[PDB]
Amino acid sequence: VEKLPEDFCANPDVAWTFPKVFYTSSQVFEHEKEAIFAKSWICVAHGSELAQPNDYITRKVIGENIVIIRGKDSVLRAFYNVCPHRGHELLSGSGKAKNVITCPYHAWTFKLDGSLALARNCDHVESFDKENSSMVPLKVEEYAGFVFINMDENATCVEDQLPGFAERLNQACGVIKDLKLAARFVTETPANWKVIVDNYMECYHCGPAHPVDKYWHTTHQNWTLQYGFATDPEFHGFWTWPCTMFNVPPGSNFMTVIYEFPVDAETTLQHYDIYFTNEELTQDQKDLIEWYRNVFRPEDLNLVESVQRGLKSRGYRGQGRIMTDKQRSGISEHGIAYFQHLVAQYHQ
């Protein structure tokens, strides 16, 4: 039971990162898994993957295999991807469901709303409860053009978690509804999910790690915006609680999105999604995909993997200095302090 003070990182001008145990402890991870990831809205996809009846996707986060499915009735729902009879998985990959889901094991059959449609011989089983033998649901919400799930069925909506975010994202990219998935990079990353957020929250490393008429990192309520000018081309980098990042590069007509799906204390599954409105890509778009694939993302992944190894050394003396400057300049690290102050509230 590692603990942090309430004002941890409350003053970004004099602040340090978490004691290293928070990036490595399996007990810390189990606490964050239940207190954060099982109670927060988790972004899983852009709405375009789920726009048509019978569309489905699958996702894996904190050990939970989830199916998100647009019903025959065009209603979006989410379920745990596990049969309520004896635990076989139900669907794999993504695509179009048939009009019923059939369990591979004993062929219990479910409508796309999760209701049990047919369970062989169940009229002969004593005290069989057909309603309450349905697929088990999660909360799902379409917000800001993206799709969020929540394992806490008592949760309130995404706007309560990210006040003002949808409004500001739509003022960064006006064509979100027209975006389509152009490429996805899936990486099982050997770093704690918070190291990856840390790395996003600063541009201190842009230049020395990646070979702008002012850059402002403003904090909001459970999200932040890195904003500036590269006409007058704007760029936007949004971090949202707990760990989904939305990038709107200069031009504001496409997006990249980083989805972090934590696995354990030192492992995070990442989706890096690239979205364009074209369904047939231009050469510029194809080259951009290859550049993200071969250069930009390998740089960022090598960084977090090396940091995760290095922070375990006894020569790394507990914590690292957050290099915040008084002027909140473009190379100031103060965004890390805002993130870590929010995390600290879950370790009281």
Next chain:
Amino acid sequence: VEKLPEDFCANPDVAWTFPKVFYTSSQVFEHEKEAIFAKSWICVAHGSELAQPNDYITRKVIGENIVIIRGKDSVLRAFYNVCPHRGHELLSGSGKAKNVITCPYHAWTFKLDGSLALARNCDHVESFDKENSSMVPLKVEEYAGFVFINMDENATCVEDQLPGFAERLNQACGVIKDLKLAARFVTETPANWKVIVDNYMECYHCGPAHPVDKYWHTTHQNWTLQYGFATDPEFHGFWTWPCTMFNVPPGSNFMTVIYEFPVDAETTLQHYDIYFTNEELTQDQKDLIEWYRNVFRPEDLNLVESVQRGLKSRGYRGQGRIMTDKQRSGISEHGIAYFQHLVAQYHQ
């Protein structure tokens, strides 16, 4: 220390599988390892692998490397496959031993009864005890044409564990002594040993998982028999405590046997052995081997691997309903309840 009630699954008509912790907990596994697998008779082979003087085999179960060896004197014995000097392994694989076993490390030499024959310079070591520096034995018994070991040297015989089993197996296949190993499939299966037993104990999935003038699943004392008619061809499927299954398909002139050698809470080493009386196989027999290899066994392994993943989900709500019908029909799951009631007696 997870616990179960004495009457757990005592009424198969209204029964559920174990709470999921029993399929996943390393503490549950350590308890079952010592209370079940280190005290029960464990089937390891058909007698034909060990029929001649100097024949030996090796097996690995619950972390124990065991050698079973027919001596020069034609007496069957079993030992731990570890040198009593400083712990080097003694034999590997299976085949014919030489007339003494020589340790690869310092060449202590043992007769095939485990007695130390020669230990270099041991007459010069103070208080060296040559008897009690022999290989360490286990109990072994030839029963029903198969070979069983027991790590508990105070154990009584296999018949006390499986009353009536040998008598009934010989009334299923009359030629067991003439069988010879025709093929063996070795698989390290990522499922708890009890998931694999569960899967064997029901034919609810035959049809939906594997593309009969009545089928009866009768329980006995620590074993069960699935029996019916496919002349009047009979079929037999025996499960025996703790987890060896003997199949005698229609025709009753060959057998397949499933040996489960648990490794840890989520890992079980399986041998799937196919036995025919012919030493030169017919084309029907060769095709059957390839069908078991490419189709039938991959189906059954995919099932248990998916169940092991799915039962860990928080959307799998603890336990699964055992679909027993009042008529004990061929698709009734009641065999699972008998098995799990027996397991529960070890978790008091």
Next chain:
Amino acid sequence: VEKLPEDFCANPDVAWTFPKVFYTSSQVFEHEKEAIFAKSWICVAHGSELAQPNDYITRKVIGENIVIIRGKDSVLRAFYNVCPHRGHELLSGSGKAKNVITCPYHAWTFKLDGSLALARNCDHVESFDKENSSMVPLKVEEYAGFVFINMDENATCVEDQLPGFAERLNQACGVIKDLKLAARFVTETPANWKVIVDNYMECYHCGPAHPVDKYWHTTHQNWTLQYGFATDPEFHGFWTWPCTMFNVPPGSNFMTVIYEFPVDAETTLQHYDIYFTNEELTQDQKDLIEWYRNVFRPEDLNLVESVQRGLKSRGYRGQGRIMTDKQRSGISEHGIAYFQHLVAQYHQ
């Protein structure tokens, strides 16, 4: 908290190896990691790898990535290979450093003495401490022609740990300063570090495991010497606390050195280094390297890997007899008792 008596193995004539838990327990390993490996001098290299200004090497031991670097000023130093800003690793492999070390993450720049030279925007960070943001040092000492590190900065010199060793090693090989690394075999060995030492400390297995006008194994203070005659060619095998072994074969003009860098209870990284004074190898030397590579070392590695597996069996009854003879002959195992008596002093 496993414990051993003070006189454990104090009488080699009647002695047994550690109870098996000391070779397998992660708690025992964590204790030895902090009480032995973080407080003792650890040999890492021959001086020839570090002889010139800007020469550096890297090593990994008990989870610590260490850089040893000869400065521009020709002073030998050692540091933890981790940036003090936010934990990125600094250098990899071995070779010649540039005149400053630049962190790949945010390009903090260090002189080769570890001093911070430049940290971007640090004059704008409140209460930034530039001295105490340097690389974190370890102790390093050149002793007997080899290079030792110590994580305990209060440690005294290598001679206090190994009294008389340098003097005796120089009386085994008179040309240590002229040796150069000719080959290195790196192996991640699945055996506890003490099994590997045990194996070195006896010649009971030479002959039965590896297809001499007296052989004497004399103990000193934290090191031992295996000495004899194969003119009158001498051979020397030194073991030094905790686990570096120095071999000077007949002829006394070359050396091999075994470096053990423990990883966890059942894993040890080994360097097997072969040193000759020639920089252009003779055919005899090339063949010797290939013989060590293909025959001699695979024998010794197979032995310790099999022992590590075998000692976990319940058929290995706790401990093994150390086969010491009254005459302390060449096949006497008494060297194991001296080593294990020293280890026992850390488990009081």
